[PDB]
Amino acid sequence: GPSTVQELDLAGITDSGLRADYIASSQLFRKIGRGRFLGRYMMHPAKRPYFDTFFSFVCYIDDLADDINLSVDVRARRLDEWQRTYLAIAKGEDEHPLSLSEQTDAALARALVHTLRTWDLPYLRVPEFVDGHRKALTTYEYADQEELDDFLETVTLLPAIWINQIFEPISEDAEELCRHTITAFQLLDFIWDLREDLDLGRLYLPLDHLARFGLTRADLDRQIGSGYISDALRELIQFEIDIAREHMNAGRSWPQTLHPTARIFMETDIQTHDSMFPEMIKDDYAFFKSPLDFVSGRMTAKAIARARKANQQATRAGYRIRPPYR
Amino acid sequence: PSTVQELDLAGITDSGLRADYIASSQLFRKIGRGRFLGRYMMHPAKRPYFDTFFSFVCYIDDLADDINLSVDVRARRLDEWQRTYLAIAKQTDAALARALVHTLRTWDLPYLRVPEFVDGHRKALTTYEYADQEELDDFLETVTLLPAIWINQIFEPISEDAEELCRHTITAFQLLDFIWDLREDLDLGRLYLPLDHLARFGLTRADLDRQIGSGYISDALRELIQFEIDIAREHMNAGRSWPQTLHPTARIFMETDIQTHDSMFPEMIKDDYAFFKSPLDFVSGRMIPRTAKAIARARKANQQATRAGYRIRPPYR
Numbered sequence: 001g002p003s004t005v006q007e008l009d010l011a012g013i014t015d016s017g018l019r020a021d022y023i024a025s026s027q028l029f030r031k032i033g034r035g036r037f038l039g040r041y042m043m044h045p046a047k048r049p050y051f052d053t054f055f056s057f058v059c060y061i062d063d064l065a066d067d068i069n070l071s072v073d074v075r076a077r078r079l080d081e082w083q084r085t086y087l088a089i090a091k092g093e094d095e096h097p098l099s100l101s102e103q104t105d106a107a108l109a110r111a112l113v114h115t116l117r118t119w120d121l122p123y124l125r126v127p128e129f130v131d132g133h134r135k136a137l138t139t140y141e142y143a144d145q146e147e148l149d150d151f152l153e154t155v156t157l158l159p160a161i162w163i164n165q166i167f168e169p170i171s172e173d174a175e176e177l178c179r180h181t182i183t184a185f186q187l188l189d190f191i192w193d194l195r196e197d198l199d200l201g202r203l204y205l206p207l208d209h210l211a212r213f214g215l216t217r218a219d220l221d222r223q224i225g226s227g228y229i230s231d232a233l234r235e236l237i238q239f240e241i242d243i244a245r246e247h248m249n250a251g252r253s254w255p256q257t258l259h260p261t262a263r264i265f266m267e268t269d270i271q272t273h274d275s276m277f278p279e280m281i282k283d284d285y286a287f288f289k290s291p292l293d294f295v296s297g298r299m300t301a302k303a304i305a306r307a308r309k310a311n312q313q314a315t316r317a318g319y320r321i322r323p324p325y326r
Numbered sequence: 327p328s329t330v331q332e333l334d335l336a337g338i339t340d341s342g343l344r345a346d347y348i349a350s351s352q353l354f355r356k357i358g359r360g361r362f363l364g365r366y367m368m369h370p371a372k373r374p375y376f377d378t379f380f381s382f383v384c385y386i387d388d389l390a391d392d393i394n395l396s397v398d399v400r401a402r403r404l405d406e407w408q409r410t411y412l413a414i415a416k417q418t419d420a421a422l423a424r425a426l427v428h429t430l431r432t433w434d435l436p437y438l439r440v441p442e443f444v445d446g447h448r449k450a451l452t453t454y455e456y457a458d459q460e461e462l463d464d465f466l467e468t469v470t471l472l473p474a475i476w477i478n479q480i481f482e483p484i485s486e487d488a489e490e491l492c493r494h495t496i497t498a499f500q501l502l503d504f505i506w507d508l509r510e511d512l513d514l515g516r517l518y519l520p521l522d523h524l525a526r527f528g529l530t531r532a533d534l535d536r537q538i539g540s541g542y543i544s545d546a547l548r549e550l551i552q553f554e555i556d557i558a559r560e561h562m563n564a565g566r567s568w569p570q571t572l573h574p575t576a577r578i579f580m581e582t583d584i585q586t587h588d589s590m591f592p593e594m595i596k597d598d599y600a601f602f603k604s605p606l607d608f609v610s611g612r613m614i615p616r617t618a619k620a621i622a623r624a625r626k627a628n629q630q631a632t633r634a635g636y637r638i639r640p641p642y643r
C-alpha cells in the first residue's frame with residue numbers, strides 16, 4: 001500500500017531480504033486472512049509488519065490444516081514440512097527451498113522468527129502450536145472440558161498470549177483478559193460452525209455437555225439443519241452460548257489493558273464477534289434449524305479513521321516501537 | 327430466506343437432489359472467499375442453480391491452483407473429478423457433480439462437455455507463459471469463456487446478442503484479473519501477459535519480476551501495462567450493454583459486477599500507476615457499502631419480477 005515503505009522504515013526493518021519476507025508474509029495474509037487483513041489499518045504503522053507476520057502465521061497454519069483438497073494425512077505431512085522448514089530457519093541450518101510451497105513456508109518462517117525474537121517471544125516453542133493443529137486433525141471428539149482445554153491451550157491460546165505481547169500491554173491483567181476474550185471467540189466459532197464440523201466428523205462440544213441434556217452425538221447430527229431442534233438441543237445450544245458469553249464478559253476489559261494503539265483493533269474485533277450472538281439466537285435459533293442464507297456480522301470503516309487519529313497522536317506523544325531483532 | 331426455502335421456490339422436491347444442492351451451497355459459502363458475492367442479488371428461486379454453478383467453478387479453480395499439491399497430483403485429481411463427473415452424468419465430489427448435472431440439464435446446457443473446462447485447467451497446469459494472443463485465446467476459451475457462455479443461459483437472455491456481450495464482458499474481467507494480480511501470479515511463476523506484448527516494449531519476464539511492487543517501474547513497463555489495460559477496456563466497452571440483453575432478474579447482478587470491474591481501471595492507473603509500485607493492500611470480494619446497497623435494490627427488483635408474473639424454469643426431471 002501507499003504506506004508499506006513507511007511501515008517497514010518506521011519499524012527499522014531495512015535488510016532487503018528480510019523486507020521481502022515481511023512483504024511476502026503480508027501478501028499471504030491478504031490472500032488467506034482476507035477481511036482480517038484490513039485490521040492492520042487499525043494498528044500503528046510501525047507495528048503492522050509484526051501484526052501482519054503473526055496473523056499470517058496463524059492464518060496460514062489454519063489454512064494448511066483446513067485445505068479441503070488434501071486428505072488429513074497430507075495435511076499432517078504439510079504441517080510437518082512447515083515445521084521442518086521453520087526449525088531449520090530458526091536454528092540457522094536454513095535449507096534452500098525449491099517448490100512454491102517450500103518457498104512460501106520459508107519466507108513466512110524467516111519473517112516469523114524475526115518477529116518473535118523482536119518481541120522476546122519463545123520462537124523455539126512454535127512447534128507446540130503446530131503439534132496442537134496436527135493432533136486436532138485426528139481428534140474427532142472431546143470427552144469433557146479437560147480434553148477440550150488441551151486443544152484450547154495449544155491451538156487457540158498459545159498464539160493468543162504471544163500476540164498479546166505484541167499488542168504491548170499496559171497492565172498485568174492483560175494476559176488473562178486475552179485468554180478469556182480469545183476463548184470466547186473460539187467457542188463462538190465452534191457453535192457457529194457446528195453443522196460444518198459435524199459434517200467433517202468433528203464435535204467440538206464436550207460430550208459430557210451433551211450428556212447433561214440427555215443428547216447423543218447422533219441426535220445433533222440428525223437435528224442441526226434438519227428443520228427442527230428439540231427442547232433439549234435448544235437448551236444445550238443456550239448452555240454453550242452462555243459459556244461463551246461468560247468468557248466474553250470476563251475478558252471485556254482487555255482493550256483498556258492494551259497500548260492505545262492496539263485498543264481500537266480489539267474493540268472492533270470484540271464487537272464483530274459480539275454480533276454473532278443475536279444472529280444465532282434470533283427467531284428461535286433458526287440458525288441451527290435450517291441452512292440460512294444471509295450476510296452476517298462480517299460476510300470497519302469508522303474504526304480505521306479513529307485509528308488513524310489515534311496513531312498520529314501516539315507518535316506525537318512519543319510512541320517509539322522497540323527496535324527490530326538484529 | 328433459507329437455502330431450503332430457495333429449493334422450495336425452484337420446485338426441487340427430490341430429497342437426495344435437495345441434499346446435493348444444500349451441499350453445493352455450503353461448499354460455495356465455505357470456499358468462495360468473496361468470489362461471486364453478487365449471489366445475494368439473484369432471484370431466490372434461481373440461487374440453487376447459481377450457487378451450484380459458482381461452487382463448481384470455484385472448486386475446480388481452487389483445486390488447480392492449490393500449491394499444497396504438486397502439479398502432477400493436481401492433474402491426476404482434476405482427471406479423477408472429470409471421470410467421476412461423467413460417470414454420474416450417466417463424496418462431496420459426487421454431490422457437487424449430481425447437482426451440477428441437474429443444474430445444467432435444467433437449463434438445456436451441454437452437460438456432457440464439462441470435461442472441456444476441467445481439461446483446460448489440466449493443460450494450463452503445465453503452461454507458465456503464452457507466446458502470443460493465439461496461445462492465450464486457447465486458454466481463455468476453455469477455462470474462462472466456456473463456463474461464461476453456459477451461465478449466460480441461466481441468466482435467461484432476451485436476445486441472441488447476449489452471448490457475444492457475455493464473451494466481451496467476461497474477457498474484460500479475466501484480462502483485468504491478470505493485470506490486477508500480476509504481482510501474485512509472477513510470484514507463483516505464471517505469466518499471463520503474452521510474451522510478444524512484452525517484446526513490443528523491449529521487456530522480459532525478469533523486468534516485470536524485478537519491478538512490480540518494488541517502488542519503481544520503467545516507462546516501458548508503464549506502456550505495457552497501459553497497453554494491456556486498453557485491450558481489457560476495449561472489451562469492457564463492447565460488452566457493457568450485456569445486462570440489457572438479460573432477463574430483468576439478472577440485471578442488477580451484472581450491472582454491479584461490470585461497475586465493480588470498471589472501478590479497477592482508475593485504481594490501477596491513478597497517481598502514475600502507484601498500484602504497481604507497492605504491495606497490494608486490497609481485499610477482493612468484501613461487503614462494502616456499494617455492494618450492500620445493490621443487494622438491497624436487487625431484493626426489491628426480484629419482488630417486482632415476481633409481481634409482474636415471473637415463471638420459474640421447471641427443474642429437470
Ligand SMILES: CC1=C(C[C@@H](C)O)c2[nH]c3ccccc3c2C(=O)C1=O
Pocket residue numbers: 054055058156159160163182185186189269
Ligand atoms: C489476535 C486474535 C487472535 C489471536 C491469534 C492471532 O493467535 C484470535 N484467535 C482466534 C481463534 C478463533 C476465532 C477468532 C480468533 C482471534 C481474533 O479474532 C484476533 O484478533
Ligand SMILES: CC1=C(C[C@@H](C)O)c2[nH]c3ccccc3c2C(=O)C1=O
Pocket residue numbers: 362380383470473474477496499500503583
Ligand atoms: C458470471 C461471472 C463469470 C462467469 C463464470 C461464472 O463462468 C466470471 N468469470 C470471471 C473470470 C475472471 C474475473 C471475474 C469473472 C466472472 C464474474 O465476475 C461473473 O459474474
